[PDB]
């Protein structure tokens, strides 16, 4: 009955893993050689990455 | 390492090795994949 005014702190811990961002047009693994890796945009040109 | 596969080319997933209800234990009969 004497509970203080309390606020929720949220977080997560995700050990042992690497934050994978796949270079795929739908972020899915449809093969080891992805569809954007075979795309003619990235295969016939040079692009900067920032 | 790879699920079973038929070859009609096209490459078709084979239904062998799947789990079923059996009156007798399935390891002494088949390989279950």
């Amino acid at each position: 009955k004497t509970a203080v005014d309390s606020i929720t702190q949220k977080k997560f811990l995700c050990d042992r893993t690497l934050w994978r961002i796949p270079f795929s047009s739908n972020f899915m693994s449809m093969g080891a050689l992805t569809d954007l890796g075979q795309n003619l945009l990235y295969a016939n040109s040079a692009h900067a990455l920032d | 390492p790879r699920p079973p596969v038929e070859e009609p080319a096209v490459e078709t997933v084979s239904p062998e090795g799947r789990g079923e209800k059996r009156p007798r234990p399935d390891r002494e009969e088949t390989l279950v994949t």
Binding site: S29, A32 | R2
Partner: peptide, 29 residues
């Protein structure tokens, strides 16, 4: 032929699957 190098389950040589010849695994690919 190379089918006499396989164990005979019955009278048939137990040949391995054609799908087990190469590896395809990568780090999520």
């Amino acid at each position: 032929n190379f089918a006499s190098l396989a164990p005979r389950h019955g009278s048939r040589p137990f040949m391995g699957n054609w799908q087990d010849i190469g590896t395809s695994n990568m780090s999520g690919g």
